[PDB]
Amino acid sequence: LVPVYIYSPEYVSMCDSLAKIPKRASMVHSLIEAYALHKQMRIVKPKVASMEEMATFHTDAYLQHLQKVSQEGDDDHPDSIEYGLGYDCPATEGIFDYAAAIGGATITAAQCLIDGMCKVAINWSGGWHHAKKDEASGFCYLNDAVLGILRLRRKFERILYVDLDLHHGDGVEDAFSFTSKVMTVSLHKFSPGFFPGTGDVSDVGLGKGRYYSVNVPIQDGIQDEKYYQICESVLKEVYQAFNPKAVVLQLGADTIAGDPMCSFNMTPVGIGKCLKYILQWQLATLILAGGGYNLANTARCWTYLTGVILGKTLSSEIPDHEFFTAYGPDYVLEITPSCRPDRNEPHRIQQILNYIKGNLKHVV
Numbered sequence: 001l002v003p004v005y006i007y008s009p010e011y012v013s014m015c016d017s018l019a020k021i022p023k024r025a026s027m028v029h030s031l032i033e034a035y036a037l038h039k040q041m042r043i044v045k046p047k048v049a050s051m052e053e054m055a056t057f058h059t060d061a062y063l064q065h066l067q068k069v070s071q072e073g074d075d076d077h078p079d080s081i082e083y084g085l086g087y088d089c090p091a092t093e094g095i096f097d098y099a100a101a102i103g104g105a106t107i108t109a110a111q112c113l114i115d116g117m118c119k120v121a122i123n124w125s126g127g128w129h130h131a132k133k134d135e136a137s138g139f140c141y142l143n144d145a146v147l148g149i150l151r152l153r154r155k156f157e158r159i160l161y162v163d164l165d166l167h168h169g170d171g172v173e174d175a176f177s178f179t180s181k182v183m184t185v186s187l188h189k190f191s192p193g194f195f196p197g198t199g200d201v202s203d204v205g206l207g208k209g210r211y212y213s214v215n216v217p218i219q220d221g222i223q224d225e226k227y228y229q230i231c232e233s234v235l236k237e238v239y240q241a242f243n244p245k246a247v248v249l250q251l252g253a254d255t256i257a258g259d260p261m262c263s264f265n266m267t268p269v270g271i272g273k274c275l276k277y278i279l280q281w282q283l284a285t286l287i288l289a290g291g292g293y294n295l296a297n298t299a300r301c302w303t304y305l306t307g308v309i310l311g312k313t314l315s316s317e318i319p320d321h322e323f324f325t326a327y328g329p330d331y332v333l334e335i336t337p338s339c340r341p342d343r344n345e346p347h348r349i350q351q352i353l354n355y356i357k358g359n360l361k362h363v364v
């Protein structure tokens with residue numbers, strides 16, 4: 001029926017106290033609210049994830065250590081480095097409750113999908129795709145995307161994970177790399193020295209999960225038209241070969257022109273065409289956020305995509321609201337691609353697609 005929107009004022013406040021995206025959650029919700037899109041959705045308060053729900057993926061030793069160091073924010077504990085806590089993922093005070101709130105919000109969205117409350121459920125504070133079962137990684141302490149998929153596996157027999165973040169969704173792919181019940185598809189920048197360094201087209205999963213991982217390595221400067229051509233080509237073949245019953249879609253906005261990552265050169269319109277293509281499958285769909293470090297452009301992107309989900313065309317002027325002064329110098333919703341080259345050679349892209357086409361022939 002109506003798409004579910006995972007939201008509460010306390011959840012956004014909890015998300016807002018995050019070292020890496022300060023006030024991002026407030027800016028996203030407040031722009032969505034300023035366009036009145038929340039009136040067209042079913043607002044659902046997130047439950048926080050129990051220990052047993054987090055342990056569907058993460059080990060008990062990791063969870064208990066995260067819980068301990070989160071007490072005083074002790075970031076000198078001797079075992080922290082063994083769990084990936086330190087540089088990118090400091091053991092700050094309250095980090096465990098913060099991670100459990102976000103994980104629980106993604107689980108809540110998945111539970112809404114199982115219960116038939118909706119066919120699209122949105123958590124614009126989720127998508128933390130780097131965390132492994134026993135190790136934090138790339139600013140991710142818990143892998144809410146994995147937790148969401150595992151919740152959807154209570155009902156759905158084949159789940160398609162699509163990861164459109166700038167970065168390779170290595171934590172999700174690693175979680176499911178030995179199984180054929182969950183297919184992972186990631187489009188991402190892949191370049192020697194670019195985080196996390198995995199996800200070449202030759203990485204196709206392991207064992208019984210061989211060919212149930214799809215990786216599309218892409219180079220700097222890609223724009224909307226070519227990105228959609230790649231994405232539609234891959235998802236068309238994946239949908240035919242895999243026949244998913246549900247979809248989890250990670251829509252990190254660090255691909256968008258103006259992001260400090262300064263890598264891809266996308267606008268939300270291009271990401272929106274990929275989203276529209278997945279939406280016409282009419283499957284249960286769990287929508288997650290991800291990266292995005294130009295805060296106004298990130299709000300622009302996820303608001304526009306919320307309008308796409310609702311089939312609404314939005315006014316170009318950013319409406320008057322709390323963060324209006326952040327949308328300069330132009331104060332419009334549309335984003336202009338930067339003037340810099342697309343480094344993607346058409347023949348390399350086509351060779352990549354041919355490989356994936358061959359890998360997918362093996363798919364059942």
Ligand SMILES: CN(C)c1ccc(C(=O)NCCCCCCC(=O)NO)cc1
Pocket residue numbers: 088130138139165166167168195252254290291292
């Ligand atoms: C301005 N400054 C001090 C830095 C800016 C960026 C990074 C970085 O990319 N580090 C590598 C870890 C990247 C994690 C990416 C998170 C993400 O968006 N995943 O999808 C480091 C320092």
Ligand SMILES: [K+]
Pocket residue numbers: 163164165166167168169186187188
């Ligand atoms: K990705």
Ligand SMILES: [K+]
Pocket residue numbers: 176177178179180181182183184205209212213
């Ligand atoms: K897999």
Ligand SMILES: [Zn+2]
Pocket residue numbers: 165166167252254290291292
């Ligand atoms: Zn990213």
